[PDB]
Amino acid sequence: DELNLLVIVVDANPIWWGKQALKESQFTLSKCIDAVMVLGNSHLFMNRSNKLAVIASHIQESRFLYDGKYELLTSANEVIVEEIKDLMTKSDIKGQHTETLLAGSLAKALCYIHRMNKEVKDNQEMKSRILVIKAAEDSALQYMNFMNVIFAAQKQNILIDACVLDSDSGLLQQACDITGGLYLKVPQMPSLLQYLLWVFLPDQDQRSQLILPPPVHVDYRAACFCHRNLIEIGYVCSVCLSIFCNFSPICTTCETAFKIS
Amino acid sequence: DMTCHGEPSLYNSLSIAMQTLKHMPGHTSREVLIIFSSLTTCDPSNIYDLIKTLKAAKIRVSVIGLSAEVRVCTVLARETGGTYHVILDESHYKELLTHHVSPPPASSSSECSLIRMGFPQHTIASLSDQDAKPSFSMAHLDGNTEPGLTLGGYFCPQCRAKYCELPVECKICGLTLVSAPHLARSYHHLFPLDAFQEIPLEEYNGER
Amino acid sequence: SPLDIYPKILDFHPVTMATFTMTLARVCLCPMIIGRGNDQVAISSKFETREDIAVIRNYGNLLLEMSAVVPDGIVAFFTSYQYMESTVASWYEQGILENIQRNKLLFIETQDGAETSVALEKYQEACENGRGAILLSVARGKVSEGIDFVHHYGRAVIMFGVPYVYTQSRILKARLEYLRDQFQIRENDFLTFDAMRHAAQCVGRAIRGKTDYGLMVFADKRFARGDKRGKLPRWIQEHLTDANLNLTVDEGVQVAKYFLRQMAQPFHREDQLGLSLLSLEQLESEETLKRIEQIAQQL
Amino acid sequence: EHHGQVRLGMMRHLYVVVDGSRTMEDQDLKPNRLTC
Amino acid sequence: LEEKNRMLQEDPVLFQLYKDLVVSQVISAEEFWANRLQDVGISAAFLADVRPQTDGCNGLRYNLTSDIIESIFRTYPAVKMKYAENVPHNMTEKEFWTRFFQSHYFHRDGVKNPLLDLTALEDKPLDEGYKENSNAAIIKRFNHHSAMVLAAGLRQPAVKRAKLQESIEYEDLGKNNSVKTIALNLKKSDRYYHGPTPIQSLQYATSQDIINSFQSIRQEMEAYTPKLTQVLSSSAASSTITALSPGGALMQGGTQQAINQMVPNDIQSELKHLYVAVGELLRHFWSCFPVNTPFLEEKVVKMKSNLERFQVTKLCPFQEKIRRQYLSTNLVSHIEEMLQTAYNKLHTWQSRRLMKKT
Ligand SMILES: [Zn+2]
Ligand SMILES: [Zn+2]
């Protein structure tokens, strides 16, 4: 009855992969796609009850991606390749939006997980986890919405695993710390698949007996809106929760004067 | 596994709650929820004087009964600004509890003060460092078992008090030690999502 | 209830004899008849059966369950002072009255005006102080004459049988004979009419508006008689569901619980708009005017 | 039931008082009032 | 003194703390206790429920309890008079209770004008020209007991007009304002979108060369074929294993030391005691802070003096006790940090006070 779902979100920002391609490094987007497909095939291999969900995170939208080889594996790989080529071939940069819709892809993944769980019969319990690979830079404006995702997963007790390739994201670190998922940056991009298999492939119960690298240290500093500097102790607004370094009689954000006689 | 015996005493319970909340800061809301099973209460003194005192103390009182409506409970809920509800079943009980989970609307007389809070990090001391000096956590210290003697954790930025759990207000200096996700956890209250337009499928001439 | 006896009683011909039925968007009255006790005893208030111990014990059980269930406001109208006193004494001897006192405070009226006034004051104070107060009076007593019950006071009104006047007064018998010899009115019919009028007076004062809801209990099998039941006010008789006809103590308790829970839920006056309450615009609707014309009935 | 964009209980000190009377053993909610 | 001694005995740790604070002259008992410093309603069932416990072995267990007697006195002041007029001279208490059981006393088996003045409800009060005793007695005494209970619960034309207004007014045809809410509308909602996250160096890419790179990668992956051998290599596999191997870079640190055996449990308990003492002292210090009244300055100075005395008289002996064993744990470092933080806070506030005055 153990139904393991491993939703994989792929950072499919064309700009970062173009930068990497111009660098002519050993690792490209094709290798990333191949590693993701192999990991998903292995996940489906480990048990019949296991399910695979692959969604590509792109700036324009979040795409639901899904001869001597397994029939279902071959069909799934064909579908994934078809969808990714259809998206990237028609991926026309129209606008200055560079940050990928990371939050939207996570929200769509959570909706898909909820729909699967509703479709899952009471006879079986569907353990769910999400693995996200980070390649491009992190986004700022999504932060709040990103937070809305995190607790939501913690609402349904879903692990969130982060695989940073190039650009670190403290948001991902905090999400992994909160939801209990694993955060780790790949030192050598060509070795990505083994990092996926050795660490992110086993389930948490399997991870329980397994010995794994300790989680990275996570900080929780704050930005003082008037200057957005690091702050240890700050003045918290009781109206709109805006934080200030110095005492103020009127809050800039809530526009409500602090009635301190 | 308690012993259900006797009758409820609204006066004593409300007096104890008020005494506990008598010294609370003005900005923090003072809300009381009461579950009333029996329709009879024994009052060692007048009850309406306590109602006046609570109203002067700006302490909100909400009542969710089980049998039927009680005039005294209705007056208490109405005068103090709270809400009085009646349980129809377990589903309605859950609905009422969920409705009481959300923060109540703020009263006009409620103050808006600029409260000062600190945000310490999870300072973990490693024995590879010569400054890995463990100290029993204040929260764990007041415990029957052995308090958590961890090398590191959360240290108060104001008085260097050590706590192994968050979010916990500091016992010594009174500082409210929180974390950034905790503040952002309630932002959906600030920005509620409006209900979507329900349209029949036949009348929805768009995507399927 | 009878629109033709008054032209006969008052010996005149009124120009218009119109009854205005009550239209309620929300049901505020729950009339129930309990002619069977816990032991399936045929509940009656005939003076031959008024001295029955089983009837007294079933009444005590009904009152105890109602006090344990229904809210503070409880009023009980008997048929005579002596019968009420004997029933109270029997309840004390049985000990059932002690449990009722444990649940709710009890107040019993006497023939003294000052004592009855103090009893009413204490009853109202207890009802407004959150402690259950039960009042015991007679259908011919002063309480049924000029005392009005608010929503929180008229929570439960229980009539112990059809209040037939003690016939030993030959003045009543002589009046019945005169009416029969001058208006073709049977004495039994007039007695039934008078008893039902007194019962309705005892019960009809428990509602003061749409938001005022109360419970009506009639603890007698004789109320099931079509002649007796048909002598009830139209606004009350219409709401008397036949499913509640001749229930038991436990069935009555369950129905009371259901009605209390249904009517204790919060309600908005806006719901009454267009259905039971009319605004300036709603009254101007010609369909509403036709409905209003259809509401009244002239006999 | 969302109300208007109004100020709410940012900091709350909630006290829950629960009856422990005889009637808590009633079966209004299964199994009894206390357990539910 | 006796009550204080009993309360201290009820909390021996506090009693030990009180001793270590007072006998060591760290704080005075006055300053010690300076910061250190149930009625039941009347139930109507106190008679029927309470019965003489007739245990089978002819045992008349009265179970005489003070609350029962107090409830009887409150409900029946006559019983209080009988008790005060008989015991301890005329009769014993138990004999009085037995007499009460045997007596018939136990075995007994208007401010508002409109709707109360039943005598005045009629405007035509002319003359009379136009087991009954047991039942009456039972009714009268029951009504008396109910009135007594109601009274113990507590322990003019204007009124008539107010009562009439309350009785006549209909909630339906009145007002339904219920708008006791304050709307809130912040100025800049973008503060939350990038909240306490500090400013990040989110660099933008170059000129149209960024579009050239995008087109290059778009064409590169437009004609893509999956690969298997290129996915991984043994050398890459060996490197990944080495990173994941014990003692590797990913395996941060490793085994640690048993702190529990490094410090005796007696030293740990004394550390707990010192932690609680210093914590309460600094809690009182911060409670006094901020100094908004001149009286608070002296109180905080006394607090600092008490902290210094406690440190010298306990931690220094505790420091020596730890040092004799040569414990490697810097448990004293935490206490020193807290003490120096408080001392620096007070010194800085004194500096601010001096600057404001000058
Ligand atoms: Zn603000
Ligand atoms: Zn602190």
UniProtKB/Swiss-Prot annotation, chain B:
GO terms for cellular component: core TFIIH complex portion of holo TFIIH complex; nuclear speck; nucleoplasm; nucleus; transcription factor TFIID complex; transcription factor TFIIH core complex; transcription factor TFIIH holo complex. One of its GO terms (molecular function) is RNA polymerase II general transcription initiation factor activity. Component of the general transcription and DNA repair factor IIH (TFIIH) core complex, which is involved in general and transcription-coupled nucleotide excision repair (NER) of damaged DNA and, when complexed to CAK, in RNA transcription by RNA polymerase II. In NER, TFIIH acts by opening DNA around the lesion to allow the excision of the damaged oligonucleotide and its replacement by a new DNA fragment. In transcription, TFIIH has an essential role in transcription initiation. Its main location: nucleus. It comes from Homo sapiens (Human). GO terms for biological process: G protein-coupled receptor internalization; nucleotide-excision repair; regulation of transcription by RNA polymerase II; response to UV; transcription by RNA polymerase II; transcription initiation at RNA polymerase II promoter. The chain holds residues 136 to 343 of 395 of the full protein. Widely expressed, with higher expression in skeletal muscle. Changing residue 173 to A: Reconstituted TFIIH complex lacks p62 and has no transcriptional activity. This is General transcription factor IIH subunit 2. Belongs to the GTF2H2 family. The keyword Ribosomal protein does not apply. It is found in: Nucleus. The keyword Transport does not apply. A zinc finger (C4-type) spans 156-173.
UniProtKB/Swiss-Prot annotation, chain C:
Residues 1-176 are annotated as: Mediates interaction with MMS19. One of its GO terms (molecular function) is 4 iron, 4 sulfur cluster binding. Changing residue 155 to W: In XP-D and COFS2. The keyword Translocase does not apply. Keywords: 4Fe-4S, ATP-binding, Cataract, Chromosome partition, Cockayne syndrome, Cytoplasm, Cytoskeleton, Deafness, Disease variant, DNA damage, DNA repair, DNA-binding, Dwarfism, Helicase, Host-virus interaction, Hydrolase, Ichthyosis, Iron, Iron-sulfur, Isomerase, Magnesium, Metal-binding, Nucleotide-binding, Nucleus, Transcription, Transcription regulation, Ubl conjugation, Xeroderma pigmentosum. GO terms for biological process: apoptotic process; bone mineralization; central nervous system myelin formation; chromosome segregation; determination of adult lifespan; embryonic cleavage; embryonic organ development; erythrocyte maturation. It is found in: Nucleus; Cytoplasm, Cytoskeleton, Spindle. One of its GO terms (cellular component) is MMXD complex. Changing residue 24 to P: In XP-D; the corresponding mutation in fission yeast causes complete loss of activity. A motif (Nuclear localization signal) lies at residues 221-234. Its main location: nucleus. ISGylated. Changing residue 261 to W: In TTD1; no longer interacts with GTF2H2/p44; has 5'-3' helicase activity. It comes from the Eukaryota. Belongs to the helicase family. RAD3/XPD subfamily. Interacts with GTF2H2/p44 via the C-terminus of this protein; mutations in the C-terminal region of XPD do not alter its helicase activity, but prevent its interaction with and helicase stimulation by GTF2H2/p44. This is General transcription and DNA repair factor IIH helicase subunit XPD. It comes from Homo sapiens.
From Swiss-Prot, chain D:
Transmembrane segments: none annotated. It is found in: Nucleus. Widely expressed, with higher expression in skeletal muscle. Component of the TFIID-containing RNA polymerase II pre-initiation complex that is composed of TBP and at least GTF2A1, GTF2A2, GTF2E1, GTF2E2, GTF2F1, GTF2H2, GTF2H3, GTF2H4, GTF2H5, GTF2B, TCEA1, ERCC2 and ERCC3. Component of the 7-subunit TFIIH core complex composed of XPB/ERCC3, XPD/ERCC2, GTF2H1, GTF2H2, GTF2H3, GTF2H4 and GTF2H5, which is active in NER. The core complex associates with the 3-subunit CDK-activating kinase (CAK) module composed of CCNH/cyclin H, CDK7 and MNAT1 to form the 10-subunit holoenzyme (holo-TFIIH) active in transcription. (Microbial infection) Interacts with varicella-zoster virus IE63 protein. Belongs to the GTF2H2 family. Component of the general transcription and DNA repair factor IIH (TFIIH) core complex, which is involved in general and transcription-coupled nucleotide excision repair (NER) of damaged DNA and, when complexed to CAK, in RNA transcription by RNA polymerase II. In NER, TFIIH acts by opening DNA around the lesion to allow the excision of the damaged oligonucleotide and its replacement by a new DNA fragment. In transcription, TFIIH has an essential role in transcription initiation. It comes from Homo sapiens (Human).
From Swiss-Prot, chain E:
One of its GO terms (molecular function) is nuclear thyroid hormone receptor binding. The keyword Cell membrane does not apply. It is found in: Nucleus. (Microbial infection) Upon Rift valley fever virus infection, interacts with NSs leading to ubiquitination by the NSs-FBXO3 E3 ligase and proteasome-dependent degradation. Component of the general transcription and DNA repair factor IIH (TFIIH) core complex, which is involved in general and transcription-coupled nucleotide excision repair (NER) of damaged DNA and, when complexed to CAK, in RNA transcription by RNA polymerase II. In NER, TFIIH acts by opening DNA around the lesion to allow the excision of the damaged oligonucleotide and its replacement by a new DNA fragment. In transcription, TFIIH has an essential role in transcription initiation. Its main location: nucleus. GO terms for cellular component: nucleoplasm; transcription factor TFIIH core complex; transcription factor TFIIH holo complex. Residues 1-37, 56-108 form the BSD domain. Keywords: Acetylation, DNA damage, DNA repair, Host-virus interaction, Nucleus, Phosphoprotein, Repeat, Transcription, Transcription regulation, Ubl conjugation. It comes from the Eukaryota. Signal peptide: none annotated. The modification Phosphoserine is found at residue 167. This is General transcription factor IIH subunit 1. Disulfide bonds: none annotated. Belongs to the TFB1 family.
